Design a protein around this nucleic acid. Structure first.
Lengths: 109, 109, 108
DNA sequence: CCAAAAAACATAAAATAACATGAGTTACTTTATGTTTTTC
DNA sequence: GAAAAACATAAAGTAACTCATGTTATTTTATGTTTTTTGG
């Protein structure tokens, strides 16, 4: 199932690809963690997803155990890949002591 | 659920954004606390919400324990984001020894 | 639980190597290195083709590594084992045909 | 019914925790370079 | 003998992961203003 983010990007969770419609020819290539993160964020749009839940889904449930540091780093990487800014955010937003939240628009295919 | 306050601001309690109609091309980013206060106030318009009720919804009913000072400080900040005047209050009014109340007009969307 | 050359005790489920001279460092094998030793010890003094080794060690769906990776894991496994490339004492090369565990293998 | 005192709230620092980034590590794959074995 | 092929080792490349250190949000403190209460 592919997703359209913010009227700009097209995210494919299978192939783990992000295609910007402003470049369209250029395929942004996401890591697994960053794809799984973006997936779960889109599955719960405009909802604040706890650090434990992201950790659970992105790592523990897949058989990897990792510091809660590794989530803060994945998000930095995801935001880089999205050309988001930490302020002023347009795609991934931070809610201290609560988790992360996908404030961009989410359409399915 | 979006809200229109005082026929000037557009309040989005989920994204935590404030668009002033006079500054339509500019997003005002509230803290979580400031956002959750304005939410609860707007949800009972022109009603006095006790200090404790504000405290419980904004902090305790989220697993966060803080001194009552944190509310006074979030209100100050909320007002600053609103450019409310402390005494000739347009939006958020103090009811000493009771709490705070939203005196501005509240329309859903 | 395998004992190799009356010296190392290999545990393929924790990927660990205990040298019995100084049981004070649990020698930590990589995945590929462990799975190689696992198959060799499972079939002692047999020559296992490269492809059977590759199949056993590398199964990841969609991504198939080059034959190069096996030559490198054997190097790495021998290093960990203190195996000499001539004359081999644990893992032996059979050109055009694969590798072969010549060390003594006892179970449990 | 008032003036003064005590209490409640407001604001700006200041402290502190949470999160963001820059920089190093680690494990895995592959190449670059060096050695041996096979085949004619 | 010399080439071709096969195997061995060290060194380079990459993403995950981690650690050190920078940024900012949240909480609390110190000081200032207003409101409530109270004593005379």
């Amino acid at each position: 199932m592919k997703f359209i983010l913010a009227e700009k990007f097209t995210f494919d969770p299978l192939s783990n690809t992000l295609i910007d419609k402003e470049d369209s020819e250029e395929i942004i290539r996401l890591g697994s963690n960053e794809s799984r993160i973006l997936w779960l964020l889109a599955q719960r749009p405009n909802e604040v997803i706890s650090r434990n839940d992201l950790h659970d889904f992105v790592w523990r449930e897949q058989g990897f155990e990792v510091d809660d540091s590794s989530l803060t780093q994945a998000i930095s990487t995801l935001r880089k890949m999205l050309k988001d800014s930490t302020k002023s955010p347009q795609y991934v937003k931070t809610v201290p002591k609560r988790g992360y939240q996908l404030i961009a628009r989410v359409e399915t295919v």
